[PDB]
């Protein structure tokens, strides 16, 4: 078995996930679609480490991540885990973005950069 575990070309490995940062701005839905084309979702955040890493990786520009609120349902991560509201999401919109100094929400149809992630083994 010659396997060595890592992320693929152009993905970034941290804490057993592989991350991808977009080079263009698109709607939250288009971004989710782009992540799914590569076996990922908009980034899910499982820990304070993940959060600290994501904020730094995002840099100064707003980046969509995998957290969305539907009427009549709780906030949910793109991996199916319900969000336990362990951090605050400001604003007044359904789709979540972050940058190195903020986690907030914006109209889903707005074009923003995005970050995907996915587990690796």
Q: What residue ranges bind Cl ion (CB under 5 A)? A: 22-25, 83-84
Q: Which of 101, 103, 33 lies closest to 67 in space, CA to CA? A: 103
| Minimum CB distance to a copy of itself, residue 82 (Å) | 25
- Greatest CA separation found in the chain? 51
Q: Which is nearer to a copy of itself, 20 or 83 (CB)?
A: 20
| Among Cl ion, Na ion, a copy of itself, none, residue 59 binds (CB under 5-8 Å by kind) | a copy of itself
* Secondary structure (3-state) at 50: helix
The tokens describing 98, both together, are 């972050």
Going by C-beta distance under 8 Å and a sequence separation of 6 or more, which residues neighbour residue 80?
none
85 vs 12: CA distance, rounded Å: 26
Which listed residue (16, 38, 39, 109) binds a copy of itself by CB under 8 A?
16
Which listed residue (13, 39, 59, 74) binds Na ion by CB under 5 A?
13
Q: Which residues bind a copy of itself (CB under 8 A)?
A: 3-7, 9-16, 21, 53, 56-57, 59-60, 100, 120-121
């Amino acid at each position: 078995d010659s396997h060595v575990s890592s992320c693929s070309e152009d993905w970034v490995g941290y804490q057993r996930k592989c991350y991808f940062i977009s080079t263009v701005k698109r709607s939250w839905t288009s971004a989710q679609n782009a992540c799914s084309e590569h076996g990922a979702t908009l980034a899910v955040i499982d820990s304070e480490k993940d959060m600290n890493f994501l904020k730094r990786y995002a840099g100064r520009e707003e980046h969509w991540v995998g957290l969305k609120k539907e009427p009549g349902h709780p906030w949910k991560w793109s991996n199916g885990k319900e969000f336990n509201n362990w951090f605050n999401v400001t604003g007044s919109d359904k789709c979540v973005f972050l940058k190195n100094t903020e986690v907030s929400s914006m109209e889903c149809e707005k074009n923003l950069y995005w970050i995907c992630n996915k587990p690796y083994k």
